Amino acid sequence: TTAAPLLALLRENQDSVKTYALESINNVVDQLWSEISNELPDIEALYDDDTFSDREMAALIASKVYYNLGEYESAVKYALAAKDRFDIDEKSQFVETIVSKSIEMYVQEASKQYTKDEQFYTKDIIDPKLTSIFERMIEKCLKASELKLALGIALEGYRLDIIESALKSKLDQSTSENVKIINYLLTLAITTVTNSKFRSSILRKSFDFLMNMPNCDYLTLNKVVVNLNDAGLALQLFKKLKEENDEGLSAQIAFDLVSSASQQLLEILVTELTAQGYDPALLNILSGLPTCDYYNTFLLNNKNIDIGLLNKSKSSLDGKFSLFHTAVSVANGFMHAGTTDNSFIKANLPWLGKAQNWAKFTATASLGVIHKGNLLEGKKVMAPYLPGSRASSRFIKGGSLYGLGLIYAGFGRDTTDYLKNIIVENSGTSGDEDVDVLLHGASLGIGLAAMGSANIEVYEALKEVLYNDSATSGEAAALGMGLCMLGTGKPEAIHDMFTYSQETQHGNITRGLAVGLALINYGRQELADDLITKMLASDESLLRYGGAFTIALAYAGTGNNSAVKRLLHVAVSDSNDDVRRAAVIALGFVLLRDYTTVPRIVQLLSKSHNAHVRCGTAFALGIACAGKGLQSAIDVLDPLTKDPVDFVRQAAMIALSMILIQQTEKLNPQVADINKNFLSVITNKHQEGLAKFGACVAQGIMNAGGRNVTIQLENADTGTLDTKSVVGLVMFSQFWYWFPLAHFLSLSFTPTTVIGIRGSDQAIPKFQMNCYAKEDAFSYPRMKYSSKPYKVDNMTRILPQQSRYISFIKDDRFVPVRKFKGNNGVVVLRDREPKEPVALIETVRQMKD
């Protein structure tokens, strides 16, 4: 085994002599390589000549040797220069291995280069050789008929041209198949790509591809206007909808977007729509007033209230301080949420008589929870207790302005303008206790009304409240500014507010502004990183606590590794107690995109010492896993219920219920034991106070909104996240700095129900639906498996578990336009023969209008 005869000839000169060896050596490089490596300097010497033009053949032999050594960067370069002898379709052990490394190298380069430029692959900034190979590698994947290989590489290597061309060529007319492809790619770009500039371009392009087809799946078209937060896509879609007018379809589109899409996007789109001419039926739908009324009808019929249980719990014992009134007040609100039963409160009136001032403010804002989902009667019922129609005391009035914001969140265009007059009044007046509380509720209430929409007039009115330097009003005021300027916000707003925290000697205000900045950040990503440092660098606990949520909110939705990592850091290295809880609760939010990651993340934290850590992860689980119920979470929570520390017990009970909302045995066996416990603690006279809030309130969540509402981080109509649910949930984890803030859970209660709409009149009917709601593997909550056909009327209780399996029947004479969309959410079916009623039930929109 010798290469020596051949190797010897390289050291001699004459081009003929060099040629005779080269080609002998070429065949057997892989075989003879040990000997050939020592002659490597000489082989490089052939290459560096350009008068002897069999340079490329030297290069190819040399590459083989370079691979075997482990200089991969060097081999790749020589392999390029070899040119017409590097063929990637031969596919040996040689060819495959250097090809791998080649894609690797472009990808690396393509990261660095995307950040600098957006055209680089068309230019001579990077290697044409590398490029050429990249373009063939792509041809190879599209030739093999797998599109998921073609796209995968093109994505990683930051080229827009390849993605575009690949979908296009392979776009076939069928329609059904295209749509599957475009959705598989939508999941993939969104959950993997955190570079906005790249991702946005793939998202926008996928709209344009569905658009090129004669029929196209409108639910997916709706999804993408939500995703990109872009007006342009939506307008073009709607002019298209004018040519193809089906009234059932056009209505289906508007009900999907109104629930799922951001509030501001919808508003500006209606402002443009009005001006071009649109149909006024549609313009009404896009406000979201009909949608909210459809749910009110649902909750009125399907209520499953159990008011005896709360009576029995209130009579169990009576003791010291304001925490336990907060507990009953909060459990009432959750129970009666959206159904509009003041039954408990109407009947039983003496316990209200025991209540002091802070408890009155808490109980009145529970009335706000009940009367949610009234679009005209919200104000009216509350009206004798609402300014200008003076009651007997202001403590009563203060939870009215707060609650009025709750009901009327998401329709608050008006509600802002009403409350701001109150804000101007009591910036002016400050010195008595009654006006301070009056304005504290007005300020929680204004921040709800102006939510998420920069109204700079509101920013100024609340800001004067700060200067008066009252701990009661200012806490609200500070939080209010955060809610309003959530999104991009002012540069000013951030800077003014951060500074004023460091100056303040008042506690309540610092905390209030701390949380206030976390909120301002919502999708602002790395551009908030600066304030995060400032906040953490404070030796103030309050700003550090808030600081964790500023990363939670800014990186919410698709996560980031650095972001999670920075929070793991904060939780570990800050021995101050409060700060540890905020950091662990914060983890939940980055990781809301897939709830599955959370039990793993927090497994270490669950055995981690400090009760503030263990409690905080309970709440986080609560938030994160409540989308479908997660069995792996409930298990983690179980030990934590039987924790000896009073507050870890509390959080576990509350957290359990948030996952286990609208669930039963055979879906979760464990819920019976859990229910026993919640009861057992209250009835007892031997437990501690903190635990006892947890038990009463836990019950209130499980059984909340007449057993018809769930806690999800989304509003279901396409399954894409909505603003309100998130914000609401960050506010709800807080009970500790001011007792009623629980109430924000009201925004994150979503009804789960299939709601049909007869499109010929735009009003709800009833039809059977083929379904799997059988009592052979399911139940509903009253004090898995599918094989048998089952039917039921519309506007009925529908679990997450049951939601999976909905279908529809076409022989009540209604046929769905988009069929089922996989999930709960308002639809519109077309009535084939419209000449008569074959079902047309009552709706509460026909009792308002």
Partner: protein
Amino acid sequence: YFKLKKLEKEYELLTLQEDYIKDEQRHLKRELKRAQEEV
């Protein structure tokens, strides 16, 4: 290539936990020293 992405998700969870454990051993050790003095 689509595959690779699936494998990255499982990888990414491991890297984050693995780094977190290091930070934990180091805090636990100081806390162990002080607490022994406290008992």
